[PDB]
Write a protein that binds this ligand. Structure first.
Ligand SMILES: C[C@H](CCC(=O)O)[C@H]1CC[C@H]2[C@@H]3CC[C@@H]4C[C@H](O)CC[C@]4(C)[C@H]3CC[C@]12C
Ligand SMILES: C[C@H](CCC(=O)O)[C@H]1CC[C@H]2[C@@H]3CC[C@@H]4C[C@H](O)CC[C@]4(C)[C@H]3CC[C@]12C
Ligand SMILES: [Ca+2]
Ligand SMILES: [Ca+2]
Ligand SMILES: [Ca+2]
Ligand SMILES: [Ca+2]
Ligand SMILES: [Ca+2]
Ligand SMILES: [Ca+2]
Lengths: 302, 111, 304, 113
């Protein structure tokens, strides 16, 4: 029978940005059927979209980096993507290498670099990389090819080599898929859904380090499941016996039931909620499996 | 000139009037599409008008562009200026990967 | 019966530096009984040292940050530590808040900052923070207080607030515990061990982004278990039924047994290894539990 | 002065000779311990000599330090210089948290011809 890790959401890892889960909420005002590509797993353990097993791969990429100074742009990186375990990336039935960012904006990335300049050798360099939604950089992670740059008055004298780019900050965040293939379609995990009438997506929320020259408001990003649930399902390879699982989210020290919900086999959780605005929930509960239920099982409202 | 393209750092126009921007480039970029782009982030900026890599003048709504491929300068015009036109713009040259771009700040004076 | 997650080491997360696991090896030339404080878990699920559940907490810290410009130093951050879920840090029977770095050197950290300066507001700022082994900074994460700085000619005009510091690079890395309490001893997970004669620690290895002005060699860091094993034991809370666990590391496509090893209850894997130099292993195998065994169980040895 | 402590950014001496380093500070740091540190990382440098916050001389091996708390200068003397003495050193003032420090590069060469 399916079970779930005994871990409070606040101790869990976000599945779309490398940070803790900080929030648990429903919000019917947000897009109902997001097409997130990370944090997507089937209850039978099948990874969907670009979802990786390891949280450390989330919103990162690995590449053979080649650098060239371009007067008036700076040092330009051409990244030939590989999978983050070092194996070759081959275009296939997903949008990009595992873990590749599945949102838009301009990302600051950090990579190890090596210079031939006298007096130093190894340092970490921050590059800027446009993700999407549309760009003039002709990004094609689906083809294993993306471009980044760093302002420089003159050449940094970098040595080409293998990198793993990790995210420093997002600028102009938009929760819409990035440019995966220079404007062309790619294979995608479908939109999250469907929901019964009155059901809404349960969101696990974290916040993204941000550049914003005017607004101090935090940048929220949601995912359908914590990363620990992804690796749990991928490891256990459960057999599914119906279309959804009835869960209870409970304080284990109080016994207080906070809500019941349905985990659809396709890897997203629904609550029955008719409110118009956000409803947040404590993050120190535990999800417990109750039973298999069919798609049409009707939940108690929150 | 080592940069592929350069322009004026700042340009000013008056409401209801026009302004002109000369995006000067180097000869190797002759047979490339030139464009005028609006906003940030830089490389997701909104193209307002673009050439087809010829010297044909193009106008789209209030923005015009023409590439002089003898002198290697493409000239942008913005007309009937509105206060909301103020902001970050870019001279751009279309190529594979990272386009050469030059940041132009546009200021609009009222009346 | 106790079991392990069906995940290859190369798909796992490192437990002492936030990065993939890249290597799986033994090396008898290295310190045999390291006193790592992260990646430490009992088979019964008890987290040891400063080990957190989430890999995102590893080598990071959360704090209420107070900033003050100091001519000749730059912008100084006084970090009043909290736990990374936002809960209050309470000094107890571990060295520091969960996830706090357990190595030495000079760390570049990244935090969200907010400025009052005209024309911007939010950005990410890199601070330098001395970790240890000994420092003149009087770092005291055990007391919930550590200091960092960024060179600045004038104030950055930062607004005090909550941060989560994530690691950018290490400079002068040393795999020895940091200054946890201004040079005083703190409660620590014990040195890893003991090992039977002929047994050495099985190491999960990753590589740390580094500053080094002269040497291009990669900076290795080892841990006793991938982070997925930590959260697995903490989640399952298995019952201990003898002294140790016999494991097999196997290629699951070919069936090839690569070696057998012992997972001691206290959270580290021993391999019986008779060579003198390092020996690496393929990282696309799977660890499987065979049996409970006594501590004195003699493993089949792996040679040169 | 506005920086708490300043030293010579570069100081050069010769084999078997001596050199001195003036670590000048502002008056508020009068009653603090002063020290001379060696190496990098900066804030784990090796302390070679440290005063007791008085004007009393301290000497260890070839290194001396003397705080003058009237002119607000602590002077460091390094004697019988050796090529291996060359490197990064620091003027330091001991305080809780981040010490005021100033980087001094020490260069050593043979006496010419
Ligand atoms: C930027 C930080 C993320 C660090 C990252 O992990 O890398 C996070 C940590 C906790 C977050 C705050 C949580 C409470 C508040 C929530 C509210 O809905 C928005 C504001 C609020 C103050 C958040 C702001 C962003 C914070 C400070
Ligand atoms: C810097 C990267 C870490 C980024 C991190 O994920 O953040 C890692 C990716 C894999 C690593 C290489 C692995 C192969 C080699 C191993 C050998 O023992 C050392 C050299 C070798 C060529 C490594 C160098 C460091 C690399 C490039
Ligand atoms: Ca394109
Ligand atoms: Ca914003
Ligand atoms: Ca382009
Ligand atoms: Ca001290
Ligand atoms: Ca090194
Ligand atoms: Ca101090």
């Amino acid at each position: 029978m399916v079970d779930l890790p005994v871990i409070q959401p606040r101790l869990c890892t976000h599945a779309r940005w490398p940070a803790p889960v900080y929030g648990l909420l429903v919000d019917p005002s947000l897009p109902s059927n997001p097409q997130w590509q990370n944090g997507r797993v089937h209850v039978d353990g099948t990874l969907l979209g670009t979802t990786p097993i390891s949280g450390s791969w989330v919103s990162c990429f690995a590449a053979e980096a080649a650098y060239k100074f371009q007067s008036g742009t700076g040092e330009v990186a051409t990244f030939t993507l590989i999978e983050q375990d070092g194996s070759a990336y081959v275009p296939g039935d997903r949008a990009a290498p595992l873990g590749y960012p599945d949102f838009s904006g301009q990302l600051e990335i950090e990579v190890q670099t090596e210079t031939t300049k006298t007096g130093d050798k190894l340092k970490v360099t921050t590059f800027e990389m446009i993700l999407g939604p549309t760009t003039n950089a002709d990004q094609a992670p689906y083809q294993g090819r993306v471009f980044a740059s760093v302002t420089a008055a003159a050449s940094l004298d970098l040595v080409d080599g293998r990198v793993r780019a990790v995210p420093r900050s997002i600028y102009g965040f938009q929760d819409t898929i990035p440019e995966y293939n220079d404007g062309l379609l790619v294979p995608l995990a479908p939109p999250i859904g469907p929901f019964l009438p009155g059901e809404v997506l349960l969101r696990f929320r974290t916040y993204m380090r941000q550049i914003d020259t005017a607004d101090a408001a935090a940048e929220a990003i949601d995912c359908a499941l914590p990363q620990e649930f992804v690796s749990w399902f991928a490891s256990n390879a459960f057999t599914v016996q119906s279309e959804a699982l009835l869960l209870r989210y409970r304080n284990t020290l109080t016994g207080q039931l906070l809500f019941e919900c349905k985990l659809y086999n396709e890897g997203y959780i629904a609550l029955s909620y008719s409110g118009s605005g956000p409803l947040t929930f404590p993050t120190d509960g535990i999800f417990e499996v109750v039973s298999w239920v069919p798609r049409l099982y009707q939940l108690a409202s929150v | 000139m080592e940069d592929p393209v350069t322009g004026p750092e700042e340009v000013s126009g008056q409401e209801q009037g026009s302004l002109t921007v000369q995006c000067r480039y180097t000869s190797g970029w002759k047979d490339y599409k030139k464009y005028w782009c609006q906003g940030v982030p830089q490389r997701s900026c909104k193209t307002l008008v673009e050439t087809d890599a010829s010297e044909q003048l193009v106008k789209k709504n209030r923005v015009s562009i023409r590439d002089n491929q003898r002198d290697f300068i493409f000239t942008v015009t913005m007309e009937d200026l509105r206060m909301s036109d103020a902001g970050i713009y870019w001279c751009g040259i279309t190529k594979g990967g990272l386009d050469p771009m030059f940041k132009v700040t546009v200021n609009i004076g009222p009346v």
